[PDB]
Amino acid sequence: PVARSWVCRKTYVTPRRPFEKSRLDQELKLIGEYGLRNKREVWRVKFTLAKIRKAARELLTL
Amino acid sequence: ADIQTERAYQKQPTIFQNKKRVLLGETGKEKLPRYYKNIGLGFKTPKEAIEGTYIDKKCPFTGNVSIRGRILSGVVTKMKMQRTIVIRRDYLHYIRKYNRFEKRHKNMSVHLSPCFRDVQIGDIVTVGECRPLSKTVRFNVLKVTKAAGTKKQ
Amino acid sequence: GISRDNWHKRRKTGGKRKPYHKKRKYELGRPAANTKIGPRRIHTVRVRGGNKKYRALRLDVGNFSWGSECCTRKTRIIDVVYNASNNELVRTKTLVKNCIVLIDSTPYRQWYESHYALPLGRKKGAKLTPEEEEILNKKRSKKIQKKYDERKKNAKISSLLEEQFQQGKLLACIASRPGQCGRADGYVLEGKELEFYLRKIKARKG
Amino acid sequence: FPMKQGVLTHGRVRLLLSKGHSCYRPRRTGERKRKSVRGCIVDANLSVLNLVIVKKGEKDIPGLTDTTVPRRLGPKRASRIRKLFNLSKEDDVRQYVVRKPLNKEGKKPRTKAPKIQR
Amino acid sequence: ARGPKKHLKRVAAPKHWMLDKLTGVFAPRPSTGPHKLRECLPLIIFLRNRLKYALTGDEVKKICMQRFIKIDGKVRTDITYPAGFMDVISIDKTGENFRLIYDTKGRFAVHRITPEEAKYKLCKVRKIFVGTKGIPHLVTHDARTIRYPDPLIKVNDTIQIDLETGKITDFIKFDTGNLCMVTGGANLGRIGVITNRERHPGSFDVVHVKDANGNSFATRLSNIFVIGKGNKPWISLPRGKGIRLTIAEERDKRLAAKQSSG
RNA sequence: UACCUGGUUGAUCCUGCCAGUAGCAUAUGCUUGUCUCAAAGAUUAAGCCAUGCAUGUCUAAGUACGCACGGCCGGUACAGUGAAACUGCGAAUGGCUCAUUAAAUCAGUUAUGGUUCCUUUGGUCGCUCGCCACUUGGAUAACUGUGGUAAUUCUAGAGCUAAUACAUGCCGACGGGCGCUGACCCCCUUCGCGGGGGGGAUGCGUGCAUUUAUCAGUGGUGACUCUAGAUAACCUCGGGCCGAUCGCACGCCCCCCGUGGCGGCGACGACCCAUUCGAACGUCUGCCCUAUCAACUUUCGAUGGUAGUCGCCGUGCCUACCAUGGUGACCACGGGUGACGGGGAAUCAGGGUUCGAUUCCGGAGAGGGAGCCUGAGAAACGGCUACCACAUCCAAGGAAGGCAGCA
RNA sequence: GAAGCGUUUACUUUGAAAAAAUUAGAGUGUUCAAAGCAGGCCCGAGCCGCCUGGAUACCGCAGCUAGGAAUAAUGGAAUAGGA
RNA sequence: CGUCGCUACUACCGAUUGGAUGGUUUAGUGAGGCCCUCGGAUCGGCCCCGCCGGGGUGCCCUGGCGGAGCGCUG
Ligand SMILES: [Mg+2]
Ligand SMILES: [Mg+2]
Ligand SMILES: [Mg+2]
Ligand SMILES: [Mg+2]
Ligand SMILES: [Mg+2]
Numbered sequence A: 001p002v003a004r005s006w007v008c009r010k011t012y013v014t015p016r017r018p019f020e021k022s023r024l025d026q027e028l029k030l031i032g033e034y035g036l037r038n039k040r041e042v043w044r045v046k047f048t049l050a051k052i053r054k055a056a057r058e059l060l061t062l
Numbered sequence B: 001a002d003i004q005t006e007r008a009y010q011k012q013p014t015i016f017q018n019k020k021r022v023l024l025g026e027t028g029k030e031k032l033p034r035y036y037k038n039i040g041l042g043f044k045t046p047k048e049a050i051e052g053t054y055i056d057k058k059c060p061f062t063g064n065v066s067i068r069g070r071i072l073s074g075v076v077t078k079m080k081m082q083r084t085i086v087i088r089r090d091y092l093h094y095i096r097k098y099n100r101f102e103k104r105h106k107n108m109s110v111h112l113s114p115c116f117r118d119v120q121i122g123d124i125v126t127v128g129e130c131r132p133l134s135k136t137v138r139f140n141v142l143k144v145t146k147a148a149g150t151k152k153q
Numbered sequence C: 001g002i003s004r005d006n007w008h009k010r011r012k013t014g015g016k017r018k019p020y021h022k023k024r025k026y027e028l029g030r031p032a033a034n035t036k037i038g039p040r041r042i043h044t045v046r047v048r049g050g051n052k053k054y055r056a057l058r059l060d061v062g063n064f065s066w067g068s069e070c071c072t073r074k075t076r077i078i079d080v081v082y083n084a085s086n087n088e089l090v091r092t093k094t095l096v097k098n099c100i101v102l103i104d105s106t107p108y109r110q111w112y113e114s115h116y117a118l119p120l121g122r123k124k125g126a127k128l129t130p131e132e133e134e135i136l137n138k139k140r141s142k143k144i145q146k147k148y149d150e151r152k153k154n155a156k157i158s159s160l161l162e163e164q165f166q167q168g169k170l171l172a173c174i175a176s177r178p179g180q181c182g183r184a185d186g187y188v189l190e191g192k193e194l195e196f197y198l199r200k201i202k203a204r205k206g
Numbered sequence D: 001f002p003m004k005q006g007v008l009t010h011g012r013v014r015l016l017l018s019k020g021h022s023c024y025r026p027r028r029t030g031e032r033k034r035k036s037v038r039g040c041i042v043d044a045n046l047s048v049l050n051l052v053i054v055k056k057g058e059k060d061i062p063g064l065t066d067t068t069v070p071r072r073l074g075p076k077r078a079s080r081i082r083k084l085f086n087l088s089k090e091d092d093v094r095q096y097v098v099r100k101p102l103n104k105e106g107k108k109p110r111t112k113a114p115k116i117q118r
Numbered sequence E: 001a002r003g004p005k006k007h008l009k010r011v012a013a014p015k016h017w018m019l020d021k022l023t024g025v026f027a028p029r030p031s032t033g034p035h036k037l038r039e040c041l042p043l044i045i046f047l048r049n050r051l052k053y054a055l056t057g058d059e060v061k062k063i064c065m066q067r068f069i070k071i072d073g074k075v076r077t078d079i080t081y082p083a084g085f086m087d088v089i090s091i092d093k094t095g096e097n098f099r100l101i102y103d104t105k106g107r108f109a110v111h112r113i114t115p116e117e118a119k120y121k122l123c124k125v126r127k128i129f130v131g132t133k134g135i136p137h138l139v140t141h142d143a144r145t146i147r148y149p150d151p152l153i154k155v156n157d158t159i160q161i162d163l164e165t166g167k168i169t170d171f172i173k174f175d176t177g178n179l180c181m182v183t184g185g186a187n188l189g190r191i192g193v194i195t196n197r198e199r200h201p202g203s204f205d206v207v208h209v210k211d212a213n214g215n216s217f218a219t220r221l222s223n224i225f226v227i228g229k230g231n232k233p234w235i236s237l238p239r240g241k242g243i244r245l246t247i248a249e250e251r252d253k254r255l256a257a258k259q260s261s262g
Numbered sequence F: 001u002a003c004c005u006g007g008u009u010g011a012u013c014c015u016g017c018c019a020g021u022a023g024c025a026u027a028u029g030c031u032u033g034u035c036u037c038a039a040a041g042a043u044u045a046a047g048c049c050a051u052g053c054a055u056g057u058c059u060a061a062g063u064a065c066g067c068a069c070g071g072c073c074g075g076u077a078c079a080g081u082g083a084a085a086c087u088g089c090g091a092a093u094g095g096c097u098c099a100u101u102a103a104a105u106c107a108g109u110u111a112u113g114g115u116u117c118c119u120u121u122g123g124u125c126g127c128u129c130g131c132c133a134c135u136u137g138g139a140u141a142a143c144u145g146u147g148g149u150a151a152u153u154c155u156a157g158a159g160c161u162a163a164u165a166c167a168u169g170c171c172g173a174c175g176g177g178c179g180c181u182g183a184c185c186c187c188c189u190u191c192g193c194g195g196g197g198g199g200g201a202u203g204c205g206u207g208c209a210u211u212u213a214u215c216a217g218u219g220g221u222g223a224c225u226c227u228a229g230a231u232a233a234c235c236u237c238g239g240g241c242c243g244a245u246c247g248c249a250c251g252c253c254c255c256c257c258g259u260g261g262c263g264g265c266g267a268c269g270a271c272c273c274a275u276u277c278g279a280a281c282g283u284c285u286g287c288c289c290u291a292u293c294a295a296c297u298u299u300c301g302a303u304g305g306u307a308g309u310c311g312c313c314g315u316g317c318c319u320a321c322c323a324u325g326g327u328g329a330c331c332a333c334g335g336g337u338g339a340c341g342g343g344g345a346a347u348c349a350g351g352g353u354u355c356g357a358u359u360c361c362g363g364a365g366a367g368g369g370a371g372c373c374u375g376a377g378a379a380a381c382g383g384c385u386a387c388c389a390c391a392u393c394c395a396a397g398g399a400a401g402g403c404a405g406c407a
Numbered sequence G: 001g002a003a004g005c006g007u008u009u010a011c012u013u014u015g016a017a018a019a020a021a022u023u024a025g026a027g028u029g030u031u032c033a034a035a036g037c038a039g040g041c042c043c044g045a046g047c048c049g050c051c052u053g054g055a056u057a058c059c060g061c062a063g064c065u066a067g068g069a070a071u072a073a074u075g076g077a078a079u080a081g082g083a
Numbered sequence H: 001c002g003u004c005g006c007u008a009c010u011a012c013c014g015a016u017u018g019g020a021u022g023g024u025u026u027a028g029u030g031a032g033g034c035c036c037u038c039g040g041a042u043c044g045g046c047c048c049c050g051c052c053g054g055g056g057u058g059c060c061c062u063g064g065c066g067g068a069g070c071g072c073u074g
């Protein structure tokens, strides 16, 4: 069958607890300071940081 | 009774019986030459298989089988079958989730050639894989060791 | 058709096995040969791989081996006298791989007469004068006679085979597979094997 | 339904016809098909009856026993040419072959010779 | 399946072909030949993906039917012919010859050879036996059999044969210290020297091979092939000399190359 | 990211669940400007299908006397382009679906010294003593003509004509060599004997493959009843091999002569061996729930032995005669599964819990069973035959079906 | 260098072998990314072409191999039928 | 707290030798294929041999009708 790939991953994760005053204030300050379109951009960079930090943590434990 | 207890003449096909026994030699007694082989893998054929009178086409030494594949060990459970016995192999099965083992067993019907006489329940046998000898028989006994026996009161 | 599959049998524990496919071709069986005694008749059957098998249905001639004398002759088959498998096979006179059959003793008698020059199978003689007298006398020279008279020493045959030759029928064993190779090759029974088969025939009828 | 030799009845019977029996050509190797065939016995119920004259009568049937038509093509195997023309051996065999003349009106006339074999 | 398979999936193709996974659904499916399909190069990918002489399978078909591709001294018109190990691909139109030897990464890389070298090719004696009339026959690692060999050549030895005749030129006895090449598994495409060999009756024998960098590994006897006597190879070794280097080493090589070339 | 919050009470600590919270995976609602990817009649019905397509195929190298073209270059077998048809091969791959299936499939491991194998590639094709060979016979296509039927990829009679279709069948090697049988001859201890041998006229079979029986012990195994030898024979009329084939440029020898004998490159073909592709059956270990399934199997093969039949092969695969065995609380057997198995997917402290119909691998199936032909390979279904269930046309005499292929 | 183990296991370490895709992950500016397996160097134009990659890790349990001998299981000579 | 009274909903039991839908085996019948033993509607060959006939010389080189050999065979 077809020669497609359909390999794709999400670049962001939604916060566990919605409607946190501290989290909403922090993210609104971030998007105001850096001119982002919406919360998905800061979530995607948070996910990138999480991946990098997880890799570093695994290497350090090794 | 005698060796020939079947409906046909039991004999080794490789061995030729009638080698023109005539008056140039005394008759007799000219004992029939015995066919045997070493099964390899360091196993030494028993002297019963060397100088016996039985015929077993499924015997590892005096029969038409070749031992190839896997060599296993087991404990003799029952000896109530003609030239075959059932052995029990006990092993441990790992369960990952509980990090613990599971005592299991698998009964195994194996052919026991008449070259092994002092075989009793509880003895540790080793078997080698061969061609299918019966419906549920695929292993042949090669060596027998006793288990705290050989001292009969 | 007839199948040789293992999955129609109960398993070792005795439980019933459910088939997971219908009868494949490679595990087929075919009707038995049931080779009889009569004029030659052989049917070719195509087998796996395009090869050829000879289902022989009737035989009359078989290549048999003396063994002790190392003489093999294409003699004829008389009938079936013993079978280890079933007595009905002997009743219906069917050739199988291990059946005991009678054969004519003429070719081996001729071999013995022409090789050892000992009259064998003849009680008194002087009845076939134009032929057998020539081969017993041969009016030959001295060196080949020196070669013959030593063969006279080892030309000793057991009384059982003597009686078989006197009777004219030699009992023997099939060795080939009539139904697979399409022939009925065999060897003459001798020694303790001959004694055991003789006592088996007497046990059937004595 | 064509009639088949050896059926030995009048009427139609269903027969499993294999390769090269009659009245059936296989669409693939080893194919067999159960077809209806009329028996070899002739009776009233027949559309046509095929008849072959074996011995000539006293007078000529109009358009049937006269005006002999030629075979479309002669022998092709050199053995068959020699058999037809009573050639013994090695006498102008390639030029004793029959040449078929094509003489269509719209094209120039010529004669065509067959490729001999063996 | 009811019979043999004559299709190969692109993802199911052997990894050493380095075929991508978007151009097509299927793989070349090499035709049957002297080599197993799992360790052979079809000529189509050898010409298209390796040398880039052709762009498509149709162009490979054109160059093959132009009768310019000669394998082991015989012209092969088969698109999916298994080129296999250490065979010689000769294009006399360009005068270029190649010998298919694995690299340190265990892949058939292009290894150009001289014409005076291409006339001969080593071979692994897979089995030895005798046929009718007592004539000895030798079956090699290819599907090639040769009659009448010297009795000093046994199983898993090596034979130096030549092209256009198929005769026996020389040989290598299997002995400790002989230089050998691994032709299968993890250590595939590594050049070393036979140091030890332990025999396991009824099973696979295991040899231990130490290379020029001191790296000692093990391999089954079935994957061991000899290309020299002791230290001198009888075949021009490909680039890298068959030494497998650690992951930091190619990083250092890449950085040195890019620093020098930047 | 190793996380919690509301709710029993007048109020407090708890237990405990309910609800909240986040992810994905189906459906659905509202809404939807751009662009790159990309799933998609699995769940219910492996229910039923109109219609169209999805497997055909030619190089110089099997067979062209089709006028369907045609160069003719002109007395000529065939220039060449070639329909159609015969021959060969393929159609057993792919594609689809997940109904069946619970030590079954399947995964890893190992074996076939217990089997077969189209094709590719490499070996073998003067290895046999044995009045056409400068080439043997017959038939059918295609094609012409006469039809039948309402109808089909339905076909009959008649007249042709070829093979790399179907058959048959030699020369050549080829001088002989070997093992028997040995007429007889010669040299012999010589003597009144044997004598130890050299020859030999006449016949008998010789090679590979098959089936027996026997003898001996060139190579390789861990281990052959292996391989290679030797002997005595068999070698099946639906009966093994021992080239009656085709193309390309064309050349050498000419004493004998003068028309013959010789040559290269291939293609096709083969009995057998090896290889490749495999396939098939086995070895060890591993599977969900269920005891409101605890004893099963064994008349009717259940476990094993002996000898056979069949099969490509090992084997209760099957038969005959025997023995009474075989499996179970370490869960047999039975039942269920909204179970095809695995690689994997979702979630993510660690450990786990669920999902894998779904593009890769293995299996199974083609409406449900069953049986076969051909072929190396099918129990094939875009092959056939029969029954059941559906269902198409008919002039009512019959004929024709298989979308879980793409739409 | 040939042979054997002064038991047999379990256990632990190493090595072989363990399809690809997917997982992690190396390199590469897809205009970034999801992806993909590519690509980069100069060209004064004749460069009458040069340099690379398509790693690596993981692959439970069972099976094979080579080291260890703590922990745990099983044994040797008691009527000596002992070495 | 329970009976009793009203209204809904939920399973349970029940005659119907329950009814119906369903999936495995015993006994009997049994299509079709395959195998075996017969069977021979036909289609060939040899002996053609009633004949004209003839060559190395009524001793038939063959060219065909036709009888049909009323046998032997595929
Ligand atoms: Mg021709
Ligand atoms: Mg299901
Ligand atoms: Mg699945
Ligand atoms: Mg699939
Ligand atoms: Mg199927």
Ligand SMILES: [Mg+2]
Binding pocket: F375
């Ligand atoms: Mg075929």
Ligand SMILES: [Mg+2]
Binding pocket: F381
């Ligand atoms: Mg079917």
